[model samples]
Target: VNSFSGYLKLTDNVYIKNADIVEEAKKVKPTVVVNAANVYLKHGGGVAGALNKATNNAMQVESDDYIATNGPLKVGGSCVLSGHNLAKHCLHVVGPNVNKGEDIQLLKSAYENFNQHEVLLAPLLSAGIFGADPIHSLRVCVDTVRTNVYLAVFDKNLYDKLVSSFL
Candidate 1:
């Protein structure tokens, strides 16, 4: 059974995890899966890359027109795609760069900007390549999301850190 061996509850409806994000997507069968993207919507690296790979790069092609018309999405801005290969819909947000500073504000905005959905799967914004502290990122996500949100962290170490450092 899925014991959720490395899961942390950030809120009654929010969770942080060190598990396969794609699997979580499968389990939740969310109406939308939110991905941390860039202004160009290039799913080249990080979680964006993985999601692209999982969905056979469907979002890459699907987002082409949107990026051409929208060009550069602001940090908290987003572009939505209808169910391609993963979820019923996909929300792509240009997340903030923690390397720049605390991105809680932008993260909060990204979380709140979603068009009301019951179950959503989100990435650990600015955590990997952007180098945001995983724990801090989780807090921002949990505090921001009022609906059920599942956070996917591929890093086991980060998961351990959040569990140990917090509780």
Candidate 2:
């Protein structure tokens, strides 16, 4: 049974399997990168919708004005969070959802991290895709990140719906 399970050992950050995403993104000279992984390694299974080993969700995160440009909240969108107004439209991308699957809290942290991004291109200031759907894809961002983030779906009505729901 143990042999059937198959096993591998990770000795350090280098031994880890998922550092290539950052490396490839670095090749392109990325301004910022987001890490949406959890403490227990939830995603990264390579299933159709599953996160891959190179998924950006597993990278180590940091603050940057350049990447903050990615966090735009469309108009009609309600922006709310406490402290650290680093960027107008930035992202933090924290994950795996906690107790009761606190979706709201996760969303709040995502915004808060954006606030600390240190650059404000423009507050998307409107409801967008995340607002309309609000699920693993919206916040996880490991796969399809280039096409499925808040910035990709910034729209006026979408923002309104997301804000009003919480209020």
Candidate 3:
């Protein structure tokens, strides 16, 4: 089995690593994989698209069914879909769009559900398309987590940039 090239225990039960979340989420088998998702929850690109493929589109099918019934998930709001293969479920969370000057609290609100699961894999919320500053996102993750969490940062610069702070 391969291991992370960079690893840090930010606090008890909270860890940060340089990892491809797809590999960690599907094959590594967390209770839930945090999908840096959209309110539409369509599995459209980035992490969302990759995860859908990992499940062979089963997750996308499930998500479509969910939205048809449940309406759109709000920014900082989330829901779970029964997952595939090694992973059992995924937390579909809509992160706030930072460019809109959306309050950072919503990003913090995003991780509030992390406590519900025993083990979870999460990307740096809003750090992708939603355009959150990665450092603040990482801080929220480190500070908010109270359960075992593997925070996967696929960006090498984000990994290397963290010389300390939470490292």
Candidate 4:
């Protein structure tokens, strides 16, 4: 694992990469893998959608059960789902809505909630259906998170630039 380290000061704990996030989750073996679920745990788009598909829609079933039992989850709030893929758990969080720039702090709060984990796989929140600049929100997440972080990227160009900037 040490051989894989580079590109940032937090090389031992932080990683940036362009690949299928679910597959990356397997390689990194994070304790908690995050899903950018909406308030209702609807697995329709963004990172949630991909996760739903990769998990064979099991993520959806678990998400529905979670909301049914936990009530309507507020933005920034998060819940954990265990026994899925390489990640032992999944941290499902209600991210910002279609409204751009809203809930930045709220999304940050979701990341904060999972800070206790030894390793965490998180999306570049507010970058997709949430409608915010990916790079900016990613920096926010990088600055705010406490535990070892694996920042997943969907674009190879974005990953390269982020790595170059960090290094």
Which candidate leads in lDDT? 3
Cα RMSD (angstroms) for every candidate in the order listed: 3.2, 17.6, 2.7, 2.8
The CA lDDT at 60 in model 4 is 84
* lDDT values for all models: 0.74, 0.28, 0.79, 0.71
Ranking by TM-score: 3, 1, 4, 2
Error of 1 at 64 (Å): 1.1
Q: Give one digit per residue, the lDDT tens place, for model 1 in 1-167.
A: 22333556766877677777777776656778888788788889888888888888777887787878867788877877865666788888776877766455787786675537777777777778877677777777666778777677787887778767763
**For this target, which candidate reaches the highest TM-score against the unseen true structure?**
3
| Better-scoring candidate (TM-score), 2 or 3 | 3
Model 2 agreement with the true structure over 48-127: per-residue lDDT tens digits: 00222343432222222222634443221222221122211223243324432435434543444444443211112111
TM-score of each: 0.84, 0.30, 0.88, 0.83
Ranking by lDDT: 3, 1, 4, 2
After superposition, the stretches of candidate 4 with alpha carbons farther than 4 Å from their true spots are: 1-13, 98-101, 164-167
